[PDB]
Amino acid sequence: MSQSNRELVVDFLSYKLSQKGYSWSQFIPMAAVKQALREAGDEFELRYRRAFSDLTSQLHITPGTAYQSFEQVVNELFRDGVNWGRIVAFFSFGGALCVESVDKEMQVLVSRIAAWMATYLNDHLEPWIQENGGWDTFVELYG
């Protein structure tokens, strides 16, 4: 559902902001899906520690930035189509964006970024997720 996904997005971003020393006040959601995603994102960031610096540069978010700009930049993660690792990269990218906004004194955008991510997932990623076993296979697969 669209609500499960919005909740999942908020949990990841809150977890990531909290984990880095930031505030999370600016704000399938099974506890298992959320824990698996929390850990998958940490593992991903273990290997890739550049925080999508160029992707974020490409986006260059301000309060004037439109969803479609976000969408175009995130589309780059999926040039070769969707996969579980790329969906984990997507969540991680949103986390990075949220950190940059707080750093730029634009805490106002973290809730915007969250809405955007929820809209992107429901629109572009859920089609592949449902086709590939749903968040259940994600959990079966990860942690």
From Swiss-Prot:
Query: Which GO annotations describe the biological process of this protein?
Result: apoptotic mitochondrial changes; apoptotic process in bone marrow cell; cellular response to alkaloid; cellular response to amino acid stimulus; cellular response to gamma radiation; defense response to virus; dendritic cell apoptotic process; dendritic cell proliferation
Tell me which stretches of the chain form a coiled coil. none
Report motif location: BH3. 33-47
Motif BH2 located where?
127-142
Q: Where is this motif: BH1?
A: 76-95
Keyword list (alphabetical) reads:
Apoptosis, Cytoplasm, Cytoplasmic vesicle, Cytoskeleton, Endocytosis, Membrane, Mitochondrion, Mitochondrion inner membrane, Mitochondrion outer membrane, Nucleus, Phosphoprotein, Synapse, Transmembrane, Transmembrane helix, Ubl conjugation
Distribution of this protein across tissues and organs: Bcl-X(S) is expressed at high levels in cells that undergo a high rate of turnover, such as developing lymphocytes. In contrast, Bcl-X(L) is found in tissues containing long-lived postmitotic cells, such as adult brain.
Q: How does it assemble?
A: Homodimer. Interacts with BCL2L11. Interacts with BAD. Interacts with PGAM5. Interacts with HEBP2. Interacts with p53/TP53 and BBC3; interaction with BBC3 disrupts the interaction with p53/TP53. Interacts with ATP5F1A and ATP5F1B; the interactions mediate the association of isoform Bcl-X(L) with the mitochondrial membrane ATP synthase F(1)F(0) ATP synthase. Interacts with VDAC1. Interacts with BCL2L11 (via BH3). Interacts with RNF183. Interacts with GIMAP3/IAN4 and GIMAP5/IAN5.
Put simply, this protein is called Bcl-2-like protein 1
The record lists the organism as Homo sapiens
Q: What gene codes for this chain?
A: BCL2L1
The shown residues of the full protein are: 1 to 196 of 233
